[PDB]
Design an enzyme around this catalytic site. Structure first.
Site, PDB file in Angstrom:
ATOM      1  N   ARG A   1       0.794  -1.211   0.000  1.00  0.00           N
ATOM      2  CA  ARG A   1       0.000   0.000   0.000  1.00  0.00           C
ATOM      3  C   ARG A   1       0.833   1.270   0.000  1.00  0.00           C
ATOM      4  O   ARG A   1       1.744   1.436   0.813  1.00  0.00           O
ATOM      5  CB  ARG A   1      -0.960  -0.025   1.192  1.00  0.00           C
ATOM      6  CG  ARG A   1      -2.417   0.240   0.825  1.00  0.00           C
ATOM      7  CD  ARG A   1      -2.801  -0.351  -0.537  1.00  0.00           C
ATOM      8  NE  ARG A   1      -2.102   0.329  -1.631  1.00  0.00           N
ATOM      9  CZ  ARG A   1      -2.360   0.160  -2.924  1.00  0.00           C
ATOM     10  NH1 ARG A   1      -3.318  -0.674  -3.317  1.00  0.00           N
ATOM     11  NH2 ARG A   1      -1.650   0.827  -3.820  1.00  0.00           N
TER      12      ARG A   1
ATOM     13  N   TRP B   1      -2.967  15.278   5.297  1.00  0.00           N
ATOM     14  CA  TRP B   1      -2.671  14.358   4.193  1.00  0.00           C
ATOM     15  C   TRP B   1      -2.109  15.014   2.930  1.00  0.00           C
ATOM     16  O   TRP B   1      -2.677  14.856   1.852  1.00  0.00           O
ATOM     17  CB  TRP B   1      -3.917  13.558   3.794  1.00  0.00           C
ATOM     18  CG  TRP B   1      -4.527  12.759   4.897  1.00  0.00           C
ATOM     19  CD1 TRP B   1      -3.931  12.379   6.064  1.00  0.00           C
ATOM     20  CD2 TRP B   1      -5.851  12.199   4.923  1.00  0.00           C
ATOM     21  NE1 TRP B   1      -4.799  11.619   6.819  1.00  0.00           N
ATOM     22  CE2 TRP B   1      -5.984  11.495   6.142  1.00  0.00           C
ATOM     23  CE3 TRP B   1      -6.935  12.225   4.035  1.00  0.00           C
ATOM     24  CZ2 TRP B   1      -7.165  10.820   6.496  1.00  0.00           C
ATOM     25  CZ3 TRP B   1      -8.107  11.554   4.383  1.00  0.00           C
ATOM     26  CH2 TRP B   1      -8.210  10.862   5.606  1.00  0.00           C
TER      27      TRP B   1
ATOM     28  N   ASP C   1     -16.341  16.399   7.992  1.00  0.00           N
ATOM     29  CA  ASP C   1     -15.501  15.377   8.596  1.00  0.00           C
ATOM     30  C   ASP C   1     -14.064  15.815   8.895  1.00  0.00           C
ATOM     31  O   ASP C   1     -13.475  16.636   8.180  1.00  0.00           O
ATOM     32  CB  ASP C   1     -15.504  14.130   7.716  1.00  0.00           C
ATOM     33  CG  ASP C   1     -15.791  14.447   6.263  1.00  0.00           C
ATOM     34  OD1 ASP C   1     -15.006  15.198   5.648  1.00  0.00           O
ATOM     35  OD2 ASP C   1     -16.803  13.949   5.728  1.00  0.00           O
TER      36      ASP C   1
ATOM     37  N   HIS D   1     -17.111  14.550  11.712  1.00  0.00           N
ATOM     38  CA  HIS D   1     -16.571  13.194  11.744  1.00  0.00           C
ATOM     39  C   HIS D   1     -15.137  13.026  12.256  1.00  0.00           C
ATOM     40  O   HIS D   1     -14.233  13.749  11.838  1.00  0.00           O
ATOM     41  CB  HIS D   1     -16.659  12.605  10.345  1.00  0.00           C
ATOM     42  CG  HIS D   1     -15.945  11.304  10.197  1.00  0.00           C
ATOM     43  ND1 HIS D   1     -16.388  10.143  10.793  1.00  0.00           N
ATOM     44  CD2 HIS D   1     -14.802  10.986   9.547  1.00  0.00           C
ATOM     45  CE1 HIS D   1     -15.546   9.165  10.513  1.00  0.00           C
ATOM     46  NE2 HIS D   1     -14.576   9.649   9.759  1.00  0.00           N
TER      47      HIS D   1
ATOM     48  N   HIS E   1     -12.158  17.598  25.338  1.00  0.00           N
ATOM     49  CA  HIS E   1     -12.251  19.047  25.395  1.00  0.00           C
ATOM     50  C   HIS E   1     -12.298  19.624  23.981  1.00  0.00           C
ATOM     51  O   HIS E   1     -13.347  20.066  23.518  1.00  0.00           O
ATOM     52  CB  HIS E   1     -11.051  19.601  26.171  1.00  0.00           C
ATOM     53  CG  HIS E   1     -11.086  21.081  26.355  1.00  0.00           C
ATOM     54  ND1 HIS E   1     -12.183  21.736  26.872  1.00  0.00           N
ATOM     55  CD2 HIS E   1     -10.162  22.034  26.094  1.00  0.00           C
ATOM     56  CE1 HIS E   1     -11.933  23.031  26.921  1.00  0.00           C
ATOM     57  NE2 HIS E   1     -10.713  23.239  26.455  1.00  0.00           N
TER      58      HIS E   1
ATOM     59  N   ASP F   1     -14.934  21.815  22.157  1.00  0.00           N
ATOM     60  CA  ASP F   1     -14.638  23.192  21.745  1.00  0.00           C
ATOM     61  C   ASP F   1     -14.895  23.451  20.262  1.00  0.00           C
ATOM     62  O   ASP F   1     -14.932  24.609  19.823  1.00  0.00           O
ATOM     63  CB  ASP F   1     -13.177  23.549  22.043  1.00  0.00           C
ATOM     64  CG  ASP F   1     -12.925  23.838  23.511  1.00  0.00           C
ATOM     65  OD1 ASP F   1     -13.632  24.690  24.090  1.00  0.00           O
ATOM     66  OD2 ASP F   1     -12.005  23.223  24.084  1.00  0.00           O
TER      67      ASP F   1
ATOM     68  N   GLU G   1     -15.400   6.840  15.224  1.00  0.00           N
ATOM     69  CA  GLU G   1     -15.166   5.433  14.888  1.00  0.00           C
ATOM     70  C   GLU G   1     -15.512   4.484  16.051  1.00  0.00           C
ATOM     71  O   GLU G   1     -14.769   3.539  16.336  1.00  0.00           O
ATOM     72  CB  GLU G   1     -13.709   5.214  14.429  1.00  0.00           C
ATOM     73  CG  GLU G   1     -13.466   3.839  13.783  1.00  0.00           C
ATOM     74  CD  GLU G   1     -12.114   3.705  13.090  1.00  0.00           C
ATOM     75  OE1 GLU G   1     -11.794   4.548  12.227  1.00  0.00           O
ATOM     76  OE2 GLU G   1     -11.371   2.745  13.394  1.00  0.00           O
TER      77      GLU G   1
ATOM     78  N   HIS H   1     -16.219  -1.261   8.769  1.00  0.00           N
ATOM     79  CA  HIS H   1     -14.987  -1.904   8.322  1.00  0.00           C
ATOM     80  C   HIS H   1     -15.099  -3.432   8.239  1.00  0.00           C
ATOM     81  O   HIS H   1     -14.169  -4.107   7.785  1.00  0.00           O
ATOM     82  CB  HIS H   1     -13.831  -1.519   9.259  1.00  0.00           C
ATOM     83  CG  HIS H   1     -13.603  -0.040   9.380  1.00  0.00           C
ATOM     84  ND1 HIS H   1     -13.260   0.755   8.306  1.00  0.00           N
ATOM     85  CD2 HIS H   1     -13.641   0.782  10.458  1.00  0.00           C
ATOM     86  CE1 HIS H   1     -13.093   2.001   8.716  1.00  0.00           C
ATOM     87  NE2 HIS H   1     -13.319   2.043  10.017  1.00  0.00           N
TER      88      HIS H   1
END
Ligand SMILES: [Zn+2]
Ligand SMILES: [Zn+2]
Length: 746
Positions: A507, A553, A591, A633, A644, A648, A657, A687
């Protein structure tokens, strides 16, 4: 005096990735691989030395993981794989790594703060270590039998354990670092075999020293290097460290270690470490100035380097200064010269592994004589253009003087004041049902409206007819990767062609590139969402991908802060949210799964991350009607220590998840908290292709009606749904509102 701490092991075209799968599935003799592997090793050693590369690492390869290669060196191979003994090989390396049919593989985790994953050693008081993997020593003789003498990179004893984890059974009161003397000899056996192999130098990576070891743990290092000194007789040792600056203590303990004649610091991310050397340093030891990023993708400001690299000559100079990469050019790409789609002007603004190898050598050279003034002229030019090219600095630096202008909490309204609104202007029942984000395909091809909505509508007619379903979801078909997508619709957002990185196994990933001050001049979603919310009479939630995640990412520039770029990438968002706002859509889900992944190893450095990180999430909807209901998400099961920041972010509804963790630990959203809002812990782990009993969700949720509230609850999956098949996804969700409709009876 040129050193390179590491190098990529899959190919300038991802060879290993395929020779692995060819092999893996039963389509090539275990020799095809070796004919392959070897054909790679040969090239890297050769290509590294041909450049003038002084220290050329050997044993940086791996069919899978550096940490596993180590686990195989000591024969720590688990018990569920059934290992009797001997020179391990394939059947057992991948067995542990990928898991065979009958028994599962081994859990994997992150290589510190990088986007790579390693195989966590599963240790304890009952494992019998054994010298059962001569990879180290063999690859040395190989490269050597090829004309080049290399440096045996290896994982540090202690660091190995620190990064190790004690698997099931072992009483809690166990000292995961008690194995030191049990593993320390198998380390010897190696050393001496290579010592006697022809090796003149050797390398020991001990990155954890750049973490926060309390006085007790640090020691571990000493008690283990005073055990090797004997073995390392008349043989230079180079202990490596990277991804941070080493704390006074850790710096001390290290620079005093027995047997070590040279040390290497990631002076790209740890430029504070310099101050501890400026202050005090050992005799005439070696210093491997690691100024060549092996993390990013831009041509190291030569000028700067040589200036600092010089500054160091002052600390030593008696011939013990060595140029080096910062971290491993594994975490970067490979050969920039596999990029054309990228206009030259820009490739001049980069440098990948291959380029970096050289990088090390031109500063290596220039700091001793022979200085190709044809590189620095070309260099300072590569510079020149970036810090000027209007493609970079933009009139986007507009929304900044309006940024330092106070935070951006959402138009006040103690949420439970707006939640009331988001009811009248959006009805709904108890525990409104919904999902997560994406869906499966069919045949697929790779006009586009006669084939576009085609499915967008079935998802529609299916999300409706399907047990009703209060709130609905569109299904990101008009995309590729939630990140890859939004990219080519923002300013400083270029893309690469062959620059790949590994993320475990075969991968690999190709994170987008952020060039100039990001910005979305044009709309990006709108009608694609109004496409569906026009067909259905039920709540159609939008689909954004937080500025946090996006940023993380990707290869983010090295000319300004992470946050600064980060925020800009948050401004454009507000543009879109405010569009599904005016565009109609009442609900807009956002998300931020890639929320935690930015945590700066140095704990005291955390609090700040969560700062611009979360403030930013807000800087997305701080201009939204008290009727619009935003959901968020986060792909974490036990974010207990980051509640927290989560509170916030100020959201009306969210998701996480959940699904495979605790229902009692959910009572963490109250005692000293009291979230007062909506939360959708994915009761059912997506999953998994295996559908859960509708009799397992009623209670799953009934355990939420307890630790949580019912006058604020949501129904949804664990994570997204872009892997699950199709006959395992239909007879599935057809059992989610069901276990809810129930209890409502009273
Ligand atoms: Zn706060
Ligand atoms: Zn997810």
């Amino acid at each position: 005096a040129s050193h390179i701490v590491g190098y990529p092991r899959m190919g300038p075209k991802r060879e290993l990735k395929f020779a692995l799968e060819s092999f893996w599935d039963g389509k090539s003799t275990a020799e095809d691989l070796q004919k392959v592997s070897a054909d790679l090793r040969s090239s890297i050693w050769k290509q590294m030395s041909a450049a003038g590369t002084k220290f050329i690492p050997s044993n940086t390869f791996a069919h899978y993981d550096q940490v596993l290669d180590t686990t195989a060196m000591l024969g720590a191979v688990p018990p569920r794989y059934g290992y009797t003994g001997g020179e391990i090989g394939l059947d057992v390396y991948f067995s542990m790594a990928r898991g065979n049919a009958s028994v599962p593989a081994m859990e994997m985790t992150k290589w510190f703060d990088t986007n790579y994953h390693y195989i966590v050693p599963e240790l304890g008081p009952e494992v019998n270590f054994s010298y059962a993997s001569h990879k180290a020593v063999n690859e040395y003789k190989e490269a050597k039998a090829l004309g080049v003498d290399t440096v045996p990179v290896l994982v540090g004893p202690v660091s190995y354990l620190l990064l190790s984890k004690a698997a099931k059974g072992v009483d809690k009161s166990f000292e995961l670092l008690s194995l030191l003397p049990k593993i320390l000899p198998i380390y010897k056996e190696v050393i001496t075999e290579l010592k006697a192999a022809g090796a003149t130098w050797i390398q020991l990576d001990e990155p954890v020293l750049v973490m926060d070891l309390e006085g007790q743990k640090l020691q571990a290092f000493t008690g283990a290097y005073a055990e090797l000194e004997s073995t390392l007789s008349g043989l230079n040792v180079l202990v490596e460290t990277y991804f941070a600056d080493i704390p006074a203590e850790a710096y001390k303990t290290l620079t005093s270690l027995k047997g070590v004649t040279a040390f290497g610091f990631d002076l790209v991310r740890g430029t504070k470490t310099l101050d501890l050397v400026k202050a005090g340093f050992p005799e005439g030891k070696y210093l491997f100035a690691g100024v060549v990023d092996g993390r990013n993708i831009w041509a190291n400001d030569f000028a700067a380097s040589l200036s600092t690299l010089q500054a160091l000559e002052g600390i030593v100079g008696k011939d013990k200064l060595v140029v080096s990469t910062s971290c491993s050019l594994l975490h970067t790409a490979v050969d920039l010269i596999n990029e054309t789609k990228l206009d030259d002007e820009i490739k001049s603004w980069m440098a990948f592994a291959a380029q970096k190898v050289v990088e090390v050598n031109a500063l290596a050279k220039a700091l001793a004589g022979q200085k190709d003034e044809a590189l620095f002229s070309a260099n300072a030019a590569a510079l020149a253009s970036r810090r000027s090219s209007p493609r970079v600095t933009n009139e986007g630096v507009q929304k900044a003087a309006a940024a330092l202008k106070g935070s951006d909490h959402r138009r006040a309204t103690n949420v439970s004041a707006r939640l009331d609104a988001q009811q009248k202007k959006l009805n709904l029942p108890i525990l409104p049902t919904t999902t997560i984000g994406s869906f499966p395909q069919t045949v697929e091809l790779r006009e586009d409206y006669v084939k576009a909505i085609k499915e967008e509508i079935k998802k529609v007619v299916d999300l409706q007819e399907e047990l009703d379903i209060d709130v609905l979801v569109h299904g990101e078909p008009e995309r590729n990767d939630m990140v890859e997508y939004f990219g080519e619709q923002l300013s400083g957002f270029a893309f690469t062609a062959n620059g790949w990185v590994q993320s475990y196994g075969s991968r690999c990933v190709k994170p987008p590139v952020i060039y100039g001050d990001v910005s979305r001049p044009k709309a990006m979603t709108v009608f694609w969402s109004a496409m569906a919310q026009s067909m259905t009479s039920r709540p159609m939630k939008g689909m954004l991908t937080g500025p946090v995640t996006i940023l993380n990412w990707s290869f983010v520039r090295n000319d300004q802060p992470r946050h600064e770029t980060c925020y800009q990438i948050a401004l454009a968002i507000k543009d879109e949210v405010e569009d599904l706002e005016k565009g109609g859509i009442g609900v807009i889900q956002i998300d931020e799964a890639a929320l935690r992944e930015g945590l700066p190893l140095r704990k005291s450095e955390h609090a700040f991350y969560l700062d611009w990180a979360v403030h930013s999430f807000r800087i997305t909807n701080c201009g939204v009607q008290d009727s619009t209901q935003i959901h968020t998400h986060m792909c974490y099961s036990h974010f207990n220590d980051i509640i927290h920041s989560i509170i916030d972010m100020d959201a009306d509804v969210i998701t996480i998840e959940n699904s495979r963790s605790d229902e009692k630990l959910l009572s963490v959203f109250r005692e000293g908290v009291k979230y007062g809002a909506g939360i959708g812990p994915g009761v059912y782990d997506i999953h998994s292709p295996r559908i859960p009993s509708s009799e397992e969700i009623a209670d799953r949720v009934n355990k939420m009606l307890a630790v949580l509230e019912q006058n604020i609850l949501w129904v949804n999956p664990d994570c997204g749904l872009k892997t699950r098949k199709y006959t395992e996804v239909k007879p599935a969700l057809k059992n989610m509102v069901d276990a809810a409709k129930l209890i409502r009876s009273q």
